[PDB]
Amino acid sequence: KQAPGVSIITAEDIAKRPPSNDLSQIIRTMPGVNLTGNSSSGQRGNNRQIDIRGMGPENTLILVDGKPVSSRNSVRYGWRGERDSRGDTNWVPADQVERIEVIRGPAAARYGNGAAGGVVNIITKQAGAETHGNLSVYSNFPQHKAEGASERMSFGLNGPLTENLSYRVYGNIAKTDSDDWDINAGHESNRTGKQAGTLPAGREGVRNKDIDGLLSWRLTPEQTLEFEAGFSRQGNIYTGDTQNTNSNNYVKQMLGHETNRMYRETYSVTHRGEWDFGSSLAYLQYEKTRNSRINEGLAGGTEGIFDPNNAGFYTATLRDLTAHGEVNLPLHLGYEQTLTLGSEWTEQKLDDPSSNTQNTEEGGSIPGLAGKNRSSSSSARIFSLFAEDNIELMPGTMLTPGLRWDHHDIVGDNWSPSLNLSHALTERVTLKAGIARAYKAPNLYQLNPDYLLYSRGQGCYGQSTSCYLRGNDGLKAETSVNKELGIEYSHDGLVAGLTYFRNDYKNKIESGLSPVDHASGGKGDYANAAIYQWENVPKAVVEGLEGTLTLPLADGLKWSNNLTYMLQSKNKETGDVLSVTPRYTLNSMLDWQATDDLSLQATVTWYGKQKPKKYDYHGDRVTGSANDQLSPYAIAGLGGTYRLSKNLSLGAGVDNLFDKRLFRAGNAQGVVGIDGAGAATYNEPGRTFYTSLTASF
Ligand SMILES: O=C(NCCCCNC(=O)[C@H](CCCCNC(=O)c1cccc(O)c1O)NC(=O)c1cccc(O)c1O)c1cccc(O)c1O
Numbered sequence: 001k002q003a004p005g006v007s008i009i010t011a012e013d014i015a016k017r018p019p020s021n022d023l024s025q026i027i028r029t030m031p032g033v034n035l036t037g038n039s040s041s042g043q044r045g046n047n048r049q050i051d052i053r054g055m056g057p058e059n060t061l062i063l064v065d066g067k068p069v070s071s072r073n074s075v076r077y078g079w080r081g082e083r084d085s086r087g088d089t090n091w092v093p094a095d096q097v098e099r100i101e102v103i104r105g106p107a108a109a110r111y112g113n114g115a116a117g118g119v120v121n122i123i124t125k126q127a128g129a130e131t132h133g134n135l136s137v138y139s140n141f142p143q144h145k146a147e148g149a150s151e152r153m154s155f156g157l158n159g160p161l162t163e164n165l166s167y168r169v170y171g172n173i174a175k176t177d178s179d180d181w182d183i184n185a186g187h188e189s190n191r192t193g194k195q196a197g198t199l200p201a202g203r204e205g206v207r208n209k210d211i212d213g214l215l216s217w218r219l220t221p222e223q224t225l226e227f228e229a230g231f232s233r234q235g236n237i238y239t240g241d242t243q244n245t246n247s248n249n250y251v252k253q254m255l256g257h258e259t260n261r262m263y264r265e266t267y268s269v270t271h272r273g274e275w276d277f278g279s280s281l282a283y284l285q286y287e288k289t290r291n292s293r294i295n296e297g298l299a300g301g302t303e304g305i306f307d308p309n310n311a312g313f314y315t316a317t318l319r320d321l322t323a324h325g326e327v328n329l330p331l332h333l334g335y336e337q338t339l340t341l342g343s344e345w346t347e348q349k350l351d352d353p354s355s356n357t358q359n360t361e362e363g364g365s366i367p368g369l370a371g372k373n374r375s376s377s378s379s380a381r382i383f384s385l386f387a388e389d390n391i392e393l394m395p396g397t398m399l400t401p402g403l404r405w406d407h408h409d410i411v412g413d414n415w416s417p418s419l420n421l422s423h424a425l426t427e428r429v430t431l432k433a434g435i436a437r438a439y440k441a442p443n444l445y446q447l448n449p450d451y452l453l454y455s456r457g458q459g460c461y462g463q464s465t466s467c468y469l470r471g472n473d474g475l476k477a478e479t480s481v482n483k484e485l486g487i488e489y490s491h492d493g494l495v496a497g498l499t500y501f502r503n504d505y506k507n508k509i510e511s512g513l514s515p516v517d518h519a520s521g522g523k524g525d526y527a528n529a530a531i532y533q534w535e536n537v538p539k540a541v542v543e544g545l546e547g548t549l550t551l552p553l554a555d556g557l558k559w560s561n562n563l564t565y566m567l568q569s570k571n572k573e574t575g576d577v578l579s580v581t582p583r584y585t586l587n588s589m590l591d592w593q594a595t596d597d598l599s600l601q602a603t604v605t606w607y608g609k610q611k612p613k614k615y616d617y618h619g620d621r622v623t624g625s626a627n628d629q630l631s632p633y634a635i636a637g638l639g640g641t642y643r644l645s646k647n648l649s650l651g652a653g654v655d656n657l658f659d660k661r662l663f664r665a666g667n668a669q670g671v672v673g674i675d676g677a678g679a680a681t682y683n684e685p686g687r688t689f690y691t692s693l694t695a696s697f
C-alpha cells in the first residue's frame with residue numbers, strides 16, 4: 001500500500017477510517033499529501049483541498065477511473081490564487097470506491113497537465129460474474145452543536161445482463177451541515193470601524209446527489225466497449241464565508257441558504273481491447289459543469305463578497321472534452337521490455353458572465369480592454385503525444401523512460417521527459433530514483449486579458465495607489481523538475497521506507513509585482529491606476545521527506561505509520577512561502593483484528609507547526625496577529641467494525657477523541673479594520689462520534 005512515490009488506499013481502508021463525506025479526509029493521510037489552500041492569503045481557508053508535496057492543489061490532478069475531473073476550473077480564480085471551491089474529491093461517494101491511487105512527483109509527470117504535484121485517481125467498484133449490490137449508511141454526531149454533522153446513504157448494484165453484457169450503477173445522497181454562522185465568535189481576529197462585528201466563517205455545508213450508470217459490452221472475447229453517464233449536484237449551505245471576511249446584508253440574508261450549486265454531468269465512451277501484440281485503450285469523456293452562484297464583486301475588499309447592486313445568480317459553464325488513445329507492446333529484445341504509445345486531446349470551453357465585468361470608470365481605462373460587455377468565453381486545447389518504455393535490464397531491476405510532448409494552442413509547445421528507476425539491492429531492499437519535468441498550463445482566468453480585478457491600493461504590490469490586475473495570454477506554462485530518491489525495506493509485512501524529494505519549480509504563475517503600464521483617466525486620487533498582469537515567477541522550490549514504517553506486532557495486530565516532513569517551500573523571487581503546510585505530519589494506525597468478526601482501530605495524527613506568509617499584498621512585512629503561528633497538535637481516534645454476517649457489518653467510533661479544536665480567526669494578513677489571523681485560517685472539528693452500517697450481497 002506504500003512504495004516509494006506511490007500510495008494505494010483500498011476499500012478496506014475506507015471502511016476502517018470512514019470519511020464524513022469528502023474523500024480528502026482519507027486521501028490526505030498518505031505520505032507527501034497535505035490538505036491546504038493553493039496560496040498563502042488564507043482566503044477561503046476552510047475550503048482546503050488535496051496538496052501533493054507542497055506544490056498546491058491546482059497541481060494535483062484528480063481522475064475518476066483514469067478520466068480527468070476539471071470542474072473546479074469553472075470557479076473564479078482570484079488575485080491571490082484561490083477559488084471559492086471545495087475542490088474535486090467529493091464527486092464519487094466513499095462507499096462505492098474500490099480504491100484510490102496517489103502518485104506523487106516524477107512518477108506523475110507522464111500524466112501531463114496539472115500533475116506537477118501528482119495524480120489522485122479514484123477507482124470505482126465494478127460488476128462481477130454474479131449480481132452483487134450494497135447499501136451504506138453513515139451518520140456522525142459532533143459534541144459541540146455549532147459544528148456541522150454529516151449523513152450519507154449510498155447504494156451500488158452491479159452484474160451481468162447477458163454473457164457479452166454487464167452493468168454497474170450507484171447512487172448517493174449526502175448532507176454535511178454547515179458550521180453555525182457564529183462558531184468562530186470570540187476567536188475572530190480584532191475587528192474595528194466599519195469592519196466591527198464581522199466574522200470569519202466556519203465550514204460551508206454541502207448537499208450531494210450522485211447517480212452513475214455504466215454498461216460494459218464485450219463485442220468480442222478480445223474487445224470490450226463501455227458506456228457511462230454521471231449526474232452529480234452539490235449545493236452548499238452558506239455560513240458567512242467571504243473572500244476578505246468582511247460582511248454586508250446580502251451575506252446575512254443568505255445564512256443557511258444555498259448560494260452556490262454545481263451540477264456536474266459526465267458521459268464517457270471507452271473501448272478496451274486485449275489481443276496478440278498487446279493491449280489497447282481509448283476513451284471519450286464529455287464533462288459539463290454548471291456553476292451557479294450569487295454574483296460577487298471584483299474590486300479590492302469587494303472581491304468575493306455577494307454584490308448587493310446586482311443580486312441574483314449567474315451561471316458559469318465549463319464544457320470539458322477529453323479523448324485518449326493508447327496501445328502497449330511487450331517487446332522481447334536486448335533487454336526484455338514493455339512499450340506504450342499514446343495521444344491525448346482535450347478542450348476546455350469556459351463561459352463565465354460575472355468574472356469579466358469589472359469596469360474602468362474609477363482607475364481609468366486600459367488600452368486594448370473594453371470597459372463594458374467583454375466576452376464571456378475562454379478556451380484552450382492541448383494536443384499530446386507520448387511513449388513510455390518499461391525495461392527489465394536484469395530481473396528485479398527496472399528502467400522506465402518516457403517522453404510527453406504537448407501542444408497548447410495558445411501557450412505553445414511543451415516537452416516533458418521522464419525517467420524512473422527501481423533496483424532490488426536485496427530481496428529485502430529496493431532503491432528507487434526518479435527525475436521528471438512536469439507541465440502546468442495556465443488556467444483560463446490567468447490567460448485571459450478580459451479578466452480584470454481592481455484595487456484602490458490595499459491589494460497592490462509595491463504601492464498604495466489604485467491598480468488593476470489583468471490576465472495575460474503571453475504567459476509561459478509552469479514547469480517543475482521533480483526529483484526523488486528513496487529506499488525501502490520490505491519483507492513479511494515489515495515495511496520501512498524513506499524518500500527525499502525536491503521539485504524545482506519554474507514559471508509559477510502568480511499576480512505580478514511591477515506595473516507593466518498605467519491606465520488613463522477615472523476619478524480623483526484613484527485616476528490613472530497601475531496595471532499589473534499575471535506573471536511567471538522565474539524560480540521556486542519545494543523539498544521534503546516522506547517516510548513509512550509498518551510493523552506486525554503479532555498476527556492479530558498491525559502498526560502502520562506515514563510521515564511527511566516539509567523542509568522548504570519558497571518563492572525565490574519574493575522569498576515568501578508558496579503554501580502554508582505543517583512542518584511535519586505523522587499518521588499512525590494500530591489495527592487489531594481482535595476476532596474473526598471484530599476489528600478495532602486506533603489512530604493518531606500529529607501536525608507540526610504552521611507559519612504564515614511574511615509579506616502582505618504590498619510586499620511589506622506583516623505585524624501583530626498576522627504573525628501568529630499554529631502550535632503542533634494531535635488528533636486521535638478509536639473505531640471498530642463488527643461483522644454480523646457475510647451480508648451485514650456495523651461500524652462505530654470517535655474522531656478527535658481528546659477534543660483538540662481550532663477556529664478560523666480570519667485571513668493571514670491585516671487590512672483596515674480587519675487584523676490578520678496568520679496561520680489560524682481553518683476550523684479543526686472537535687470530538688465527533690460516528691456510526692455506520694453496510695449491507696451487501
Ligand atoms: O479607502 C479605501 N477604499 C474606499 C473605502 C470604502 C470601501 N469600504 C469597504 O468596506 C469595502 C470592503 C473593505 C474590506 C477590507 N478590505 C480588504 O480586505 C481588501 C483586500 C484586498 C484588497 C483590497 O483593496 C482590500 O481593501 N471596499 C470597497 O468597497 C472597495 C471598492 C472598490 C475598490 C476597493 O479597493 C475597495 O476596497 C481604500 C484605500 C486604499 C486602499 C484600498 O484597498 C482601499 O479600499
Ligand SMILES: [Fe+3]
Pocket residue numbers: 299300301302455456457458459
Ligand atoms: Fe480596497
